[PDB]
Curated annotation (Swiss-Prot), chain A:
Glycans are attached at N129, N153, N189. This is Spike protein S2'. Subunit of the fusion protein that is processed upon entry into the host cell. Mediates fusion of the virion and cellular membranes by functioning as a class I viral fusion protein. Contains a viral fusion peptide that is unmasked after S2 cleavage. This cleavage can occur at the cell membrane by host TMPRSS2 or during endocytosis by host CSTL. In either case, this triggers an extensive and irreversible conformational change that leads to fusion of the viral envelope with the cellular cytoplasmic membrane, releasing viral genomic RNA into the host cell cytoplasm. Disulfide bonds join C87-C98, C137-C181.
Length: 196, 153, 218, 164
C-alpha cells in the first residue's frame, strides 16, 4: 500500500488537472472555440481572461502539490539510501532500523518506484527461570565476569553469555579480580576453579 | 469578487498547513527514531541521546509532543599523567589489550580510559608484537609474570 | 570561553571521577486536526452562491482531500512513536531497584489521571464558519499508558523487550551493561552503587525544578 | 439565556475573532447568547461489501438529540451498538473509540485495546536467559521515485489559438 499511494496520488492529481479544463470559471463557455465563434473579438478579451485565471490557478495548485510530494518522496529516498548503506552494506548497531530484533543482514529487492528490504533478524525464543548474582566472593577477592553473567540453576553457579544459554565453569580465565567482597551488594559465596 | 478573495485565503491556508505538516512529521520521524534508539537500547552515536556518554533514557508524554529524559555519563575530575605507546622488554614490545599505559612519576600502570583504576602491567592484559626499535616513544619497564613465582616454589 | 589545554607527546588526561547527568529533550509529535468546508466558509446559507461555486469545478474537492491527508497522518505520527511496543508492561509494587528511585517518572495511582509527577506539570504549562476540530485517535490517557508500558519495560527488562521477548534483570545489574557499552568495566558501578543511585535521584529531581523555573523550556 | 455583565450602554458582543456572540434584546433588559447552529460532517462506517452491506453513520461534532444511538466524543453513532469489553482497533473513529464487525452479526463500538497485559516477574536476584532463538525475516517497503511529468502552458491553457 505504500507504493500504491504514490501511483494513485499522482494519477488522481493529473485527472483533476484535465477536469479543470471543463470549468467555466465565470465565463460563458468552458470550451475555447465557442467563445470566439459566438462573441465579437473587440469584447471577447474579457471572456478569455476569465478562463486564463482559472486555468493558471489549476497549474499553480498542481505544481505546488507536486513540490510537496517531491519532498515526501525524497525524504523516503534519502531514507532508502541510508537503509541500503547500513542494513545491506553492513551490520547496524541501531535498534529497530533494520527490522524488529537483533539485525544480522538484509537483502534488497527492486520494486516499481520503490525498494523492498528483506531484513533478517535474530529473535530469542525460549527462556526460563534463573538466579543471578552481581559477583562472587573468594579468599579476600571479588570476581566479576568479563563478557558473561553469573547464573544459578538452584544448586550450582555458572557463567554464560546473555543472548544464549551456554553455561561454563567459573574459572580465572573468564573472570577478573577487583577488590574484596564487602562493598558489592548482593555478592554470593562460591569457589573459583583454578585451571593451573 | 468575494469568491476569488476567499478561495485564495483557503489556498494559502492549506498550503501553509502542508508546509507545517512536513515539519511536524520530520520531527515525528525523528521522535520515532529517538525512542527506538535511546529508550529501546543504548546508542553508540554521539550527541543523539544527550550530551555525554549515553546510558539510558526515559520517555515522558506531553501534549502534542514527547519529552525525553536522557541519562548521560559525564566525566568529572581528571589530573596529570604521563603516557607511553608501549613498553619494551627482553627483546619484546608489550601493547595493552583494552587499556592505556600511564605513569604517576615513578611507576608505570595500566588502566582503562574512561576511569582511573590502575593495575600491575602483567602478561594477561598485554600482548607481545615485535621488538622495541620500531615504535617511537617506547619506554623501559618490567612486566610481572604471574606464573614465574609458581615455578620457583 | 578561551581554553588552551596542555598538549604533549607523552602526556594524557584520565578522569578519576564522573557525574551522572540527566538532560531534557522535547520533540513535537502531532498537530491539531482541522477540517474546513467550502460550502459554509465561503458562503453559508446562500443558495445563489453555491450555484456560482460549481463553475470553478473541483477546487474544493482536492482542498478537503489535502486537509484529510494531514489529519489522517497526525494520528499516524503518534503510532510509530508511542506504540513501538505491542504489549503493556507493569511495574511491580515492590520498588526495590537497588537504591534507584523512579517516583517522578512512574505513574501515580492516587490521581484520577494515571500520570507521572513530571507529566503532571508538563500538561499544566500548555494551554465557526465551517471550522471544526477533530479529536485525536489516541486520548491523553492512552499515550500515558503507552509511556508507562515503555517505562516498565526499560527498568525491568532494558533493551530485551524491544528485540524480542521481555527478559527480567535487576536494575542494579543491567546498569553495568550500560557501563560496558561506553568502555567502563562492571566494577565501577558496584563499587559506587550508592553514589550513582544518589546522583541519579538528585538529577531526576532537578528536572522538575528546571522545567518549572522558566516557561521558555517548553 | 446568559449570565453576562453587559454595560447599560452596550448592546453588541464580540469575541477575539470578531463574531457576534451575545446581543441584547432591545425591549427587555436581558442578555442572550448566540452560538452557531450545530453542524458537522457525515461519516459512514462500513466493513467490506463482500462481507456485509450494513453501515454505521457517524454524525461528527453534534449532540444528536436534535437530529442504536451511542454518544461519543467525536459525535455519535447510529446503527452501531456499544459493548463493555475492549477489542483491537481496525476502523478508527476518534477519542479511543473504534468500530468493528463482530458478534447474528452487527457493528459494535468499543474502547481501544492498547495491547496484551503482561506482568513480568521482577526480582533483585532473578534473570531470564534465552535457551533458543528464531531467525525472522521481515519485509520493509520504501518508495524511491515519482513519475516524471511535464506540463506546457502553451498547449494546456489554450491550444491552437493564436489570439490567446
Ligand atoms: C544444575 O546443573 C548442574 C550441572 O549440570 C547439575 O549437576 C549435575 O547434575 C546431574 C544430574 O543430571 C548429576 O548427574 C551430576 O553428577 C551433577 N554434577 C555434579 C558436579 O554434581 C545440577 O544437578 C543442577 N541442579 C538442578 C537443581 O537442576
Ligand atoms: C562468605 O564466606 C565468608 C567467610 O568464608 C563469610 O565471612 C564470615 O562472616 C561471619 C558472619 O558475617 C563472620 O562471623 C566471620 O568472621 C566471617 N569470616 C571471615 C573469614 O571474614 C561471609 O559472611 C560469607 N558470605 C555469605 C553471603 O554467606
Ligand atoms: C605512584 O604510585 C605508586 C603505587 O601506589 C606509589 O608507590 C607506593 O607509594 C606509597 C606511598 O604512599 C609507598 O608506601 C609504597 O611503598 C609504594 N609502593 C612501592 C611498590 O614502592 C608511588 O609512590 C607513586 N609515586 C608518586 C610520585 O606519587
Ligand atoms: C632499554 O634497555 C635496553 C637494554 O636494557 C637499552 O638498549 C641499550 O642501548 C644502549 C644505547 O642505546 C646500547 O649501548 C646497548 O647496547 C643497548 N643494549 C641492548 C641489550 O640492546 C635501551 O636503550 C633502553 N631504552 C631506553 C629508552 O632507555
Ligand atoms: C566523586 O564525586 C562525588 C560527587 O560527585 C564525591 O561524593 C562526595 O564526596 C564528599 C566527600 O566528603 C561528600 O561530602 C559528598 O557528600 C559526596 N557527594 C555525594 C552526592 O554523595 C566522591 O567523593 C568523588 N570521589 C572521588 C574519588 O573523588
Ligand atoms: C523517591 O523520591 C520521592 C521524592 O522525589 C520520595 O518522596 C518523599 O518521601 C519522603 C519520605 O519517604 C517524604 O517526607 C517526602 O515528602 C516525599 N516527597 C515527595 C515529593 O513526595 C520517595 O520516598 C522516594 N522513594 C523512596 C523509595 O524513597
Ligand atoms: C530450538 O528451536 C528449534 C525450532 O525453532 C527446535 O528445532 C525443532 O526440534 C524439534 C524436536 O523434536 C523437531 O521436531 C523440529 O523439526 C525442529 N524444527 C526444525 C525447524 O528443525 C530445536 O529443537 C530447539 N532447541 C532446543 C534446545 O530447544
Ligand atoms: C522463575 O523462578 C524464580 C524462582 O525459582 C522466580 O523468582 C521467578 O519469578 C520465576 N519466573 C517466572 C517467569 O515464572
Ligand atoms: C533482595 O530482595 C529480598 C526481598 O525480595 C531481600 O530480602 C534481600 O535482602 C534483597 N537483597 C539485596 C542484595 O538487595
Ligand atoms: C600535568 O603535568 C604534566 C607534567 O607533570 C604537564 O606536562 C602537563 O602540562 C600538566 N597538565 C596540566 C593540565 O596542568
Ligand atoms: C617528545 O617531545 C619532546 C619535546 O617536547 C622531545 O624532546 C622528545 O624527543 C619527543 N619524543 C618523541 C617520542 O617524539
Ligand atoms: C413597552 O411599552 C409598553 C407601553 O405600550 C409597556 O407596557 C411595556 O412594559 C414596555 N416594555 C418594556 C420591556 O418596558
Ligand atoms: C447533549 O444533550 C443532553 C441533553 O439531553 C445533555 O445531557 C448532554 O450533556 C449533551 N452532551 C454534550 C456533550 O453536551
Ligand atoms: C455495560 O456496562 C454497564 C455498567 O457499567 C451496563 O449498564 C450496560 O448495560 C452494559 N452494556 C452492555 C451492552 O452490556
Amino acid at each position: 500500500g505504500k507504493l500504491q499511494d504514490v501511483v494513485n496520488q499522482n494519477a488522481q492529481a493529473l485527472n483533476t488537472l484535465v477536469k479543470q479544463l471543463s470549468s467555466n470559471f465565470g465565463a460563458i463557455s468552458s470550451v475555447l472555440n465557442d467563445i470566439l465563434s459566438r462573441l465579437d473579438p473587440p469584447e471577447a478579451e474579457v471572456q478569455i481572461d476569465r478562463l486564463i485565471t482559472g486555468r493558471l490557478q489549476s497549474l499553480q495548485t498542481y505544481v505546488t502539490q507536486q513540490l510537496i510530494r517531491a519532498a515526501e518522496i525524497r525524504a523516503s529516498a534519502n531514507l532508502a539510501a541510508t537503509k541500503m548503506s547500513e542494513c545491506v552494506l553492513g551490520q547496524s548497531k541501531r535498534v529497530d532500523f533494520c527490522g524488529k530484533g537483533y539485525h544480522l543482514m538484509s537483502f534488497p529487492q527492486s520494486a516499481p518506484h520503490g525498494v523492498v528490504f528483506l531484513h533478517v533478524t535474530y529473535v530469542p525464543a525460549q527462556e526460563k527461570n534463573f538466579t543471578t548474582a552481581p559477583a562472587i566472593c573468594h579468599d579476600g577477592k571479588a570476581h566479576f565476569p568479563r563478557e558473561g553473567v553469573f547464573v544459578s540453576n538452584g544448586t550450582h553457579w555458572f557463567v554464560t553469555q546473555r543472548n544464549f544459554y551456554e553455561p561454563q565453569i567459573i574459572t580465572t580465565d573468564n573472570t577478573f579480580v577487583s577488590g574484596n567482597c564487602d562493598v558489592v551488594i548482593g555478592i554470593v559465596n562460591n569457589t573459583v576453579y583454578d585451571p593451573l | 469578487r468575494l469568491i476569488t478573495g476567499r478561495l485564495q485565503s483557503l489556498q494559502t491556508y492549506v498550503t501553509q498547513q502542508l508546509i507545517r505538516a512536513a515539519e511536524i512529521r520530520a520531527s515525528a520521524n525523528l521522535a520515532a527514531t529517538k525512542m527506538s534508539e535511546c529508550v529501546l537500547g543504548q546508542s553508540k552515536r554521539v550527541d543523539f541521546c544527550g550530551k555525554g556518554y549515553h546510558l539510558m533514557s526515559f520517555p515522558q508524554s506531553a501534549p502534542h509532543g514527547v519529552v525525553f529524559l536522557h541519562v548521560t555519563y559525564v566525566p568529572a575530575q581528571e589530573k596529570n599523567f604521563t603516557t607511553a605507546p608501549a613498553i619494551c622488554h627482553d627483546g619484546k614490545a608489550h601493547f595493552p589489550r583494552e587499556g592505556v599505559f600511564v605513569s604517576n612519576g615513578t611507576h608505570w600502570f595500566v588502566t582503562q580510559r574512561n576511569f582511573y583504576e590502575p593495575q600491575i602491567i602483567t602478561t594477561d592484559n598485554t600482548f607481545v608484537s615485535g621488538n622495541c626499535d620500531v615504535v617511537i616513544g617506547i619506554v623501559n619497564n618490567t612486566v610481572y609474570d604471574p606464573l614465574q613465582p609458581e615455578l620457583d616454589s | 570561553a578561551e581554553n588552551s589545554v596542555a598538549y604533549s607527546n607523552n602526556s594524557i588526561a584520565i578522569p578519576t571521577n564522573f557525574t551522572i547527568s540527566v538532560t531534557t529533550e522535547i520533540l513535537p509529535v502531532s498537530m491539531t486536526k482541522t477540517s474546513v468546508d467550502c460550502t459554509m466558509y465561503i458562503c453559508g446559507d446562500s443558495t445563489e452562491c453555491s450555484n456560482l461555486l460549481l463553475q470553478y469545478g473541483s477546487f474544493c474537492t482536492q482542498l478537503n482531500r489535502a486537509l484529510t491527508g494531514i489529519a489522517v497522518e497526525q494520528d499516524k505520527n503518534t503510532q510509530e512513536v508511542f506504540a513501538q511496543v505491542k504489549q503493556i508492561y507493569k511495574t511491580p509494587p515492590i520498588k526495590d531497584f537497588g537504591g534507584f528511585n523512579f517516583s517522578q517518572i512512574l505513574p501515580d495511582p492516587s490521581k484520577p489521571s494515571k500520570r507521572s509527577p513530571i507529566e503532571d506539570l508538563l500538561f499544566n504549562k500548555v494551554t465557526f464558519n465551517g471550522l471544526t476540530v477533530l479529536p485525536p485517535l489516541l486520548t491523553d490517557e492512552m499515550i500515558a499508558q503507552y509511556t508507562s508500558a515503555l517505562l516498565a519495560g526499560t527498568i525491568t527488562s532494558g533493551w530485551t523487550f524491544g528485540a524480542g521477548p521481555a527478559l527480567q534483570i535487576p536494575f542494579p545489574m543491567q546498569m553495568a551493561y550500560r557501563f560496558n557499552g561506553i568502555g567502563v568495566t562492571q566494577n565501577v558501578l558496584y563499587e559506587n552503587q550508592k553514589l550513582i543511585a544518589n546522583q541519579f535521584n538528585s538529577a531526576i529531581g532537578k528536572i522538575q525544578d528546571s522545567l518549572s523555573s522558566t516557561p521558555s523550556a517548553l | 439565556e446568559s449570565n453576562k455583565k453587559f454595560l447599560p450602554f452596550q448592546q453588541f458582543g464580540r469575541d477575539i475573532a470578531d463574531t457576534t456572540d451575545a446581543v441584547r434584546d432591545p425591549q427587555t433588559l436581558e442578555i442572550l447568547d448566540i452560538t452557531p447552529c450545530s453542524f458537522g460532517g457525515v461519516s459512514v462506517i462500513t466493513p467490506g461489501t463482500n462481507t456485509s452491506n450494513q453501515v454505521a453513520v457517524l454524525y461528527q461534532d453534534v449532540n444528536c438529540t436534535e437530529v442504536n444511538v451511542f454518544q461519543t466524543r467525536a459525535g455519535c453513532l447510529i446503527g452501531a451498538e456499544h459493548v463493555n469489553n475492549s477489542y483491537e482497533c481496525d476502523i478508527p473513529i476518534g477519542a479511543g473509540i473504534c468500530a468493528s464487525y463482530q458478534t447474528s452479526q452487527s457493528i459494535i463500538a468499543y474502547t481501544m485495546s492498547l495491547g496484551a497485559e503482561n506482568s513480568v516477574a521482577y526480582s533483585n536476584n532473578s534473570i531470564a536467559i534465552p535457551t533458543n532463538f528464531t531467525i525472522s525475516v521481515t519485509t520493509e517497503i520504501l518508495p524511491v521515485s515519482m513519475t516524471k511529468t511535464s506540463v506546457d502552458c502553451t498547449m494546456y491553457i489554450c491550444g491552437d489559438s493564436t489570439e490567446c
